Design a protein around this ligand. Structure first.
Ligand SMILES: CC(=O)SCCNC(=O)CCNC(=O)[C@H](O)C(C)(C)COP(=O)(O)OP(=O)(O)OC[C@H]1O[C@@H](n2cnc3c(N)ncnc32)[C@H](O)[C@@H]1OP(=O)(O)O
Ligand SMILES: CC(=O)SCCNC(=O)CCNC(=O)[C@H](O)C(C)(C)COP(=O)(O)OP(=O)(O)OC[C@H]1O[C@@H](n2cnc3c(N)ncnc32)[C@H](O)[C@@H]1OP(=O)(O)O
Ligand SMILES: CC(=O)SCCNC(=O)CCNC(=O)[C@H](O)C(C)(C)COP(=O)(O)OP(=O)(O)OC[C@H]1O[C@@H](n2cnc3c(N)ncnc32)[C@H](O)[C@@H]1OP(=O)(O)O
Ligand SMILES: Cc1ncc(C[n+]2csc(CCOP(=O)(O)OP(=O)(O)O)c2C)c(N)n1
Ligand SMILES: Cc1ncc(C[n+]2csc(CCOP(=O)(O)OP(=O)(O)O)c2C)c(N)n1
Ligand SMILES: Cc1ncc(C[n+]2csc(CCOP(=O)(O)OP(=O)(O)O)c2C)c(N)n1
Ligand SMILES: [Mg+2]
Ligand SMILES: [Mg+2]
Ligand SMILES: [Mg+2]
Lengths: 546, 546, 546
């Protein structure tokens, strides 16, 4: 009579569901679970802080449509991971945070258990669902629920709570195997109303000035070929939002990225593809035509009419809706007016000339534009990389300047504009893909997760961290207004040498003050596949404060 | 007609209430508030992550009984600070986290505002109270509430939400000044039932084997002289809990710290002073006498009978209760039986001899005992320092070995056993006191807040960080059980040189492999008052795993 | 320039969205809103308690797919309505509860406002969404969101909070009109993956013992003709769950209702149509074959694998799914094994014979069977009624014995087994339909909403309330086990005459003790269309417990 326990059961359930990586920080009561998972051939990546583990998991979910798995301990570790779970739900990235919890009887009486918290209830506001498993025979179905919840609808974080007692709880091994559930097709296709599709095509065909906006839902869908075919067939100008850059290459002739304001102000019919009318699009209000008509492809009927009335909702999974839209277009072809494309190009060209001046003009110290021009030159020759990016000036300028050539290669601060995603996203992207990562980091941004450089060294991951060191938050030229000479609230240490941090962990560091030095250091870093920090000296006065 | 705005009003309210320090991370919508606070002579300390800002604030509250102030931005920064606010409430440390929030109208409709979150409601589970201020004329009374709530009863975290619009909202300056509220005596004395006090003394006087346990409520109360007088008058053996070490010096002849198990198993009457029967005391169950009778001094009547029935509750603020207890003892003196003290001393001596062997026996590599013996030798000569401590082996062994000579000088992982409090507590303690800090840090523990070494350098704070580098969580000799040769879930990088991190920020680093080297490096670090990291090479096999 | 205010704007928005009835209880700050809605041609129905108003709104939603509107005041009224909102969400019935709230500034500071509560946050755990409107120009979009959310996915309750200030807030009339949103097609069709449809048909065609279960979702969908055609085409036995009775008439040859236990114990393939594997189906565990394979038609992907692994999820709206299932069956026809249908029929006849004996045997006093047989005699002759039903014995027996002939005519205690839905569901059904209602009520059940008989009288609604008066909860023969002779916890007043309650409100009352009296009284009630109570004297010892 062979016995097993809850810990072995949950590991087997993860294995059967093709989980091959767990991102976490161990401790009571989950250390043995991690060790056993690794024994069973799951890759374990241990972090310096759970929030970076959670960011890594969500990145892996965005890239793959399989929920990333984040493992934490009870209360103190759980709360750190929860901050990341919250971010995944806001952004629409599938992940499951699995946390140990303490003694249900003691916690339910608030008697002061070890790491006491009702973690299930704590996670509820920040997750698509929060489940807690009390019986080992329910672990398999619980994981099945968590997987389906995380990837169905608009994807997001799910919390799965494993009390210490369920991990230790025993059952007969043969019976235990019958309770494990392998989920086939956890996010089934949901097809739109055919009438919606016909109405959408008809409205586009009548448009004088149609515009498609590709949002991160579009990128997540992996409908890359359908989106490109639709756009090129009808020659419809498009605006890629940050993490949608690269679905079509950013150099594509139909991209209106360089005339964004003109496009939003003048488009008459706008087709949102997995793009919400939230603050990133000014809620469809400021800067938009008074009477824009919207077509909206979104999986969530609850998102329709959230901000502006939507003329033609196309509710369904984006891949299925794009298949329908393409089929309807084939039967009822149209071509966007050439005049609209031509006038867009006038505006794009005006801005391109202004950008080109900034990119190509040398300054000492460096500014954002000439530094990022050097980065742009290198990355153009290394189109296999993933790009992670966070900061304020460092974020907005890199978003504009660094062209993405392939889809789902850009990961950034996202909908909540979180500083602290940089190292976790780099680790998640590198582990998931096996590809090199370049992280373009504000100096303040980097400080939120910088201890993870040891994690990067520990697993010898090919991450090149390029820190835009302007000596502060937005700018480094702040002054203490009291006259006391203290650092201002936005100042960081003058001339910190972040490259030297790598010396602690046997990584590589470069300090750079010119575009030639930056180009060399970045090329060498990427080619070397060694963990590398490049400290870029940026003019403290170059940035603007939002 | 001179006008002012909400931002100026809240700064003036903080000033009038003797807030002289704010710990935070700025960004929209609070940067100008921080700059203006600093203009007005409030010291601003900016962190690399809000959780360390929040830990600093709570430390300052524990040391002073004045709530520490933590300032954050909206959603992403707020959530990071919230993790620390939660910790303050659990531990009983007064603090106020002030966060900017976004547009109430947009957030209430869930339309996707910039940094959208109902932060007030989010903070409610983790705070004594959560307030949100919509009108500038209510800022003064709101701050008054927050101060009184944070320090009254059992102290804890309070959340104060300032929507961006209230900061910008204007009012006439003279009228505005009339709405500012200076709180006098925000935590008034609450005196116990005199019958409780008489019953407590009577029970102690009948005890064969009485024991006092001093908890962090005792330390917080600053009733140092009354506690010492009571203990010495009746010669009552006492057990200091971690953050109560030093109320009486740890070398005091009545301390039963070195016979803890014997004391708990054999005491007949136990007087808890600001000490909960939670997991840290095994809930008064395992390891206790079957029929212990409890006296409990606590400010919270809701804590009485939480775990074991309490024979004599003494409900009131600990300082007031100790004044009553001392007065009642003076009228009805007794002396603890000498036999009980003598048999305690037998057991203390048995353990002292075992400890002394471990402390004084050289090993290569170093172990926890001989390394901490070197630390003990230095700290005995530097009794003006604050000691911050976190880890597992690093925590438990330092707690046992490093004697505290003065009260409220030890700050550690606390009731939730949080890793990540080390740098924030060191910064809070240093800024508050103007004294040197020694942080004795596990290598895993340090990784949770290690980027704050730049903060320490930026403000040139006299913090010596001693990292017990055993190469992992508990131990550094883990193995990948799959045979693939990957780092085990508990391993960190082999032979990381954390001392080299200081090179980035112009701090000082020492690497040490012997007790002589450690003693020298630690003495020099403390005397120098320079930001310093000491990397201590500890045997990877020395630690135990809980 | 002509002005308007929030109150006028929201009424106009309700009108434009074809809201023609509001169910409510007035008071500050919503009385004028109700007066004006009524002025504008909306039918106002005022209740004696908000819980019944909310039940009425949810009933109307179930019957129509248009959310019922419940209107309440702030805290005390809001909380009463919330209990009903919670029930709507659990059951999947669309409704919007609109509540006034107090002063956001005062409530956010917890200063003790008039009827102070954060109502939006209070409603969140019980609603699909909770929205709060601060600006009158956002009232139209807020209502548009509330409508869409309430009827999409699995339908449910939405809370819409209107602070007193928004109702009073003014704007220019013409501009205000441009902010009103008329929602077209609030729940668009969502079609299932074609492969899942083909898989479902394939599995059914291979089944030896297939069974369809029709749940409330099937009833709500209004796919009556598609369901009938599918069932009849393949001759698939079906089980109607309570509120799905009548989709096909309960006397249909293929109904397995009279062999329910045998059918669940023996089916090999079970097709759930808008039916959860919750407690009502014993979670697919107790009473089921060990290896049942499930097809599940549900709109909510989060419901799949909640309890038992589901072999063939068919995710999409039920009407759309059934259209696809029907089309696929046509291309791939099959006939359910005759042997299976025959065996079911053997079991059905045996239970029908046992039923007939209980039904046809007269007793004094009446029992549940002969009383309900009398009721069925009358309802057989009066088929255009609505049936409301609640109780324990009164519920289970009426569910079994009263055949439904048409869909969406039965309303009962539902998924949470709530006592107190009877009067509200009766009012909602009669107001919505214009048809007579028969409410078959346990005497305890009736007590939960009994004051609403005045409401029934006030609006002269054709409701006949048939109270099964057995003198208590389950039974009326309880004894005080102390010997003191007090009523037992399940006893109600011996021989209460509920019919006399109607005297207070000029309604009609009958007391009945025999089947003949019962038949006459019920026939007269229905045909008179007068508010009527029939007090039915039931044997206190007839019922069973639990
Ligand atoms: O700030 P957001 O509102 O997010 O706009 P975003 O960062 O996309 O673009 C900012 C500006 O840079 C312009 N633009 C963006 N990327 C590029 C580029 N690579 N080259 C030239 N112009 C650019 C945009 O058109 C916009 O200018 P506009 O207001 O004149 O249209
Ligand atoms: O682990 P906890 O239950 O928290 O106990 P704590 O860390 O206070 O003490 C652990 C052990 O070290 C002993 N002790 C604590 N500090 C010292 C010290 N400085 N010297 C010798 N013994 C010590 C305690 O008595 C206890 O041993 P015991 O079980 O034999 O009493
Ligand atoms: O109790 P539930 O599990 O809810 O079952 P339900 O109320 O539908 O039926 C209870 C019993 O009455 C039987 N049944 C239900 N309605 C009728 C009816 N009108 N005539 C005869 N038998 C009936 C069921 O088959 C079941 O008996 P079974 O266990 O022998 O199959
Ligand atoms: C967790 C978190 N805390 C605070 C903020 C506020 N914030 C916005 S940008 C920013 C950093 C800006 O400085 P940096 O990253 O150095 O970029 P720069 O503009 O200097 O290039 C911060 C802290 C945030 N977005 N997230
Ligand atoms: C925020 C948080 N995450 C995880 C844990 C679990 N945990 C307990 S001790 C510990 C670290 C132990 O290693 P270390 O600090 O290096 O001390 P050592 O025992 O090796 O001396 C961790 C991560 C925790 N307590 N808090
Ligand atoms: C709001 C609410 N309170 C309590 C219950 C528990 N409960 C179940 S059935 C029932 C009443 C049973 O008696 P009755 O309605 O008279 O029917 P009978 O069995 O006597 O025919 C009650 C109170 C409930 N379901 N809902
Ligand atoms: Mg910067
Ligand atoms: Mg360690
Ligand atoms: Mg009854």
């Amino acid at each position: 009579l062979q016995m097993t326990d809850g810990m072995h059961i949950i590991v087997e359930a993860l294995k059967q569901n093709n989980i091959d990586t767990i991102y976490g920080v161990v401790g009571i009561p989950v250390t043995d679970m991690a060790r056993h998972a690794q024994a069973e051939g799951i890759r374990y990546i241990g972090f310096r802080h759970e929030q970076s583990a959670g960011y890594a998991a969500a990145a892996s979910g965005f890239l793959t449509q399989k929920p990333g798995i984040c493992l934490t301990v009870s209360a103190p570790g759980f709360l750190n991971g929860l901050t990341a779970l919250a971010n995944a739900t806001v952004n629409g990235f599938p992940m499951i945070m699995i946390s140990g919890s303490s003694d249900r009887a003691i916690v339910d009486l608030q008697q002061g258990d070890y790491e006491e918290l009702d973690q299930m209830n704590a996670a509820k506001p920040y997750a698509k669902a929060a489940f807690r498993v009390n019986q080992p025979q329910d672990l398999g179905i619980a994981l099945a629920r968590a997987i389906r919840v995380s990837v169905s609808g608009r994807p997001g974080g799910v919390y799965l709570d494993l009390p210490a007692n369920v991990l230790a709880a025993t059952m007969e091994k043969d019976e235990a195997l019958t309770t494990i559930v392998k989920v086939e097709n956890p996010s089934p296709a949901l097809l739109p109303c055919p009438k919606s599709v016909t109405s959408a095509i008809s409205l586009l065909a009548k448009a004088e000035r149609p515009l498609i906006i590709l949002g991160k839902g579009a990128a997540y869908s992996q409908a890359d070929e359908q989106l490109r075919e639709f756009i090129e067939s009808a020659q419809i100008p498009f605006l890629p939002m940050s993490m949608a850059k690269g679905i079509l290459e950013d150099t594509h002739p139909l991209s209106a990225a360089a005339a964004r304001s003109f496009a939003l102000a003048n488009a008459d019919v706008v087709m949102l593809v997995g793009a919400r009318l939230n603050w990133l699009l000014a809620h469809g209000k400021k800067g938009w035509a008074a009477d824009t008509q919207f077509i909206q492809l979104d999986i969530e009927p609850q998102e329709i009419d959230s901000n502006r009335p939507i003329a033609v909702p196309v509710v369904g999974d984006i891949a299925s809706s794009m298949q329908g839209m393409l089929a309807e277009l084939k039967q009822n072809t149209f071509t966007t007016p050439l005049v609209w494309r031509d006038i867009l190009n006038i505006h794009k060209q005006q801005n391109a000339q202004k950008m080109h001046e900034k990119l190509s003009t040398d300054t000492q110290p460096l500014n954002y534009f000439n530094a990022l021009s050097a980065v742009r030159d290198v990355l153009r020759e290394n189109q296999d990389i993933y790009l992670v990016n966070e900061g304020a000036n460092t974020l907005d300028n890199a978003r504009n300047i660094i062209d993405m050539y392939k889809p789902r290669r850009r990961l950034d601060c996202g909908t909540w504009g979180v500083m602290g995603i940089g190292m976790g996203y780099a680790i998640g992207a590198s582990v998931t893909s096996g590809s090199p990562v370049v992280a373009i980091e504000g100096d303040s941004a980097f400080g939120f997760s910088g201890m993870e450089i040891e994690t990067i060294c520990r697993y010898n991951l090919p991450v090149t961290i390029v820190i835009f060191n302007n000596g502060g938050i937005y700018r480094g030229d702040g002054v203490d207004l009291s006259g006391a000479g203290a650092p201002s609230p936005t100042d960081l240490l003058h001339h910190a040498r972040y490259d030297k941090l790598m010396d602690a962990f046997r990584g590589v560091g470069y300090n750079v003050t010119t575009t030639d030095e930056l180009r060399h250091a970045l090329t060498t870093g990427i080619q070397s596949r060694k963990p590398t920090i490049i400290n870029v000296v940026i003019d403290p006065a170059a940035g603007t404060e939002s």
